[PDB]
Design a protein around this ligand. Structure first.
Ligand SMILES: COc1cccc(-c2nnc3n(Cc4ccccc4Cl)c(=O)c4ccccc4n23)c1O
Length: 489
């Protein structure tokens, strides 16, 4: 669960909640009111509340006095498990008890103000057996609207003295507690119909041709913020093991110690110099053309990077960062100078030719294994150089033109392995490019008359690598990129 996340509270409201309803070690996370885009970790320690800043410009969640994380749920899981790791004056702050939110806003099934006719319309067009939703009455009360078979049933939810009930039995502290209770224990109608709450009603799948319509509606005060926070709440489902990236020998192979690859999707390296030679902070991304999502090379991982590219038969690399951003190294130069030949362990690379375009540089690389001439293949490195240091480009035209070229290159190469995509941590810009590429590929094959579901695509990608698509800004950029691609069709 992710109930410690309160989406609509102020700092003073946060302070009051921890002072009146919490104890020492009680905490909550919330979006920052003083700096929208940021987050605040509010912790009760010695009868007092501390407000700690969490930053995200698009690469990772950066906790002040803490570490860099892929998701807020990964951050909370780590600190609830590892005490002594979080400091203010250098004093330790412990996350012991999550203070739960009762707010139903970011639940997939909450529709707020919605008619009984409209709820019936939606459950008929998009609903299947067991599809449900929770909307407001119609006053101060709520309505649960289920589909079965086929019919639609309306169950009235009473709100009596800040608790919720279906007209008898238990009284719940939140609509979420009620929904979970009747999801587990389904209500039986007198004539024996089981009102099974199987899955929430889909509210995000749109027909591609109607992108402009939904973008216009999501731009209204914002709807994009609401849609994104509903996706963020689903991240609690994605805390898969990242045990390999934790091994003593693998520690220094990570750019960010706590941003790790899922064990089930990580790229396992097989070249193996005959002890622990099978690790790279990289994951295979499969839609539903594959990708490898990875971090910017470290001086000690360059050789491993080339072993991965060789093993996977990848012929295209998408670099989405400058080597150095804001005076900080984001990726080491893992390729030779133009016309030069370098050996990276057992792997040999020649930089045949570089071509400078407006937003990017193309490098034609020749990769082979040392002592085996019949292993040579061309690797095309597309280096996007103009992405802003913070946030996203103000227009998607540059990214789209670039992705078009990457796609046509990859498509011209017979039996080419997955496309390699990296930035610094390999989750934000990497996640964004991969998702846009996946969505635009659906529109390539099936045309403007196709269903696209942006947060479902992101969720699918996030189960293969942690925190793929970091910010609400990148989320809005994925919509704008797809809108512009459809407009030029
Ligand atoms: C079924 O699911 C799982 C099964 C087994 C292991 C994991 C697992 N893998 N990484 C972590 N980290 C992340 C972690 C740990 C050490 C150093 C850096 C990091 Cl970034 C935790 O902090 C953690 C805390 C509590 C429970 C599991 C955790 N976990 C998992 O998720």
């Amino acid at each position: 669960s992710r109930r410690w996340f309160h989406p609509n509270i102020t700092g003073v409201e946060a302070e009051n909640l921890l002072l009146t309803r919490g104890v020492d070690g009680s905490f909550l996370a919330r979006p920052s009111k003083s700096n929208p885009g940021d987050f605040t970790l509010s912790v009760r320690r010695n009868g007092a509340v501390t407000h700690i800043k969490i930053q995200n410009t698009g690469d990772y969640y950066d906790l002040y006095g803490g570490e860099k994380f892929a998701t807020l749920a990964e951050l909370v899981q780590y600190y609830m498990e590892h005490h002594g790791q979080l400091k203010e004056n250098g004093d330790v702050i412990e996350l012991k008890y999550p203070l739960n939110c009762a707010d139903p806003t970011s639940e997939r099934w909450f529709h707020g103000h919605l008619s009984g006719k409209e709820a019936e319309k939606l459950l008929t067009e998009k609903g299947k057996h067991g599809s449900f939703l929770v909307r407001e009455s119609q006053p101060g009360d709520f309505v649960l609207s289920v589909r079965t078979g086929s019919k639609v049933t309306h169950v009235m939810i009473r709100c009596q003295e800040l608790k919720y009930d279906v007209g008898g039995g238990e009284r719940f502290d939140s609509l979420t507690d009620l929904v979970e209770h009747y999801k587990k224990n389904p209500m039986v109608e007198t004539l024996g119909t089981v009102l099974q709450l199987k899955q929430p009603l889909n509210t995000t799948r749109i027909n591609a041709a109607e992108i402009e319509s939904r973008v216009r509606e999501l731009s209204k005060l914002q709807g994009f913020w609401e849609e994104f926070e509903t996706l963020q709440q689903q991240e609690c489902k994605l805390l898969y093991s990242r045990k390999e990236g934790q091994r003593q020998e693998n520690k220094n192979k990570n750019r960010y110690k706590n941003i790790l690859p899922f064990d089930h999707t990580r790229v396992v390296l097989h070249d193996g110099d005959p002890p622990v030679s099978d690790y790279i902070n990289a994951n295979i991304i499969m839609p539903e053309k594959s990708y490898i999502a990875t971090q910017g090379c470290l001086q000690n991982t360059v050789n491993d990077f080339w072993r991965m590219v060789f093993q996977e038969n990848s012929r295209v690399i998408v670099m989405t960062t400058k080597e150095v951003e804001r005076g900080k190294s984001k990726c080491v130069k893992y390729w030779p100078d133009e016309y030069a030949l370098k050996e990276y362990g057992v792997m040999r690379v020649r930089n045949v030719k570089e071509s400078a375009a407006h937003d990017y540089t193309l490098r034609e690389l020749k990769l082979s294994k040392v002592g085996q001439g019949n292993t040579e293949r061309t690797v095309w490195q597309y280096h996007f150089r103009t992405w802003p240091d913070h946030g996203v480009p103000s227009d998607p035209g540059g990214v789209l033109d670039f992705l078009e070229e990457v796609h046509h290159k990859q498509e011209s190469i017979m039996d080419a392995g997955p496309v390699v995509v990296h930035c610094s941590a390999g989750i934000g810009r990497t996640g964004t490019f991969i998702v846009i590429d996946i969505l635009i590929d659906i529109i390539r094959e099936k045309g403007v008359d196709c269903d696209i579901d942006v947060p479902k695509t992101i969720q699918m990608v996030r189960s293969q690598r942690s925190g793929m698509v970091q910010t609400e800004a990148q989320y809005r950029f994925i919509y704008m990129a797809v809108q512009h691609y459809i407009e030029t069709l």
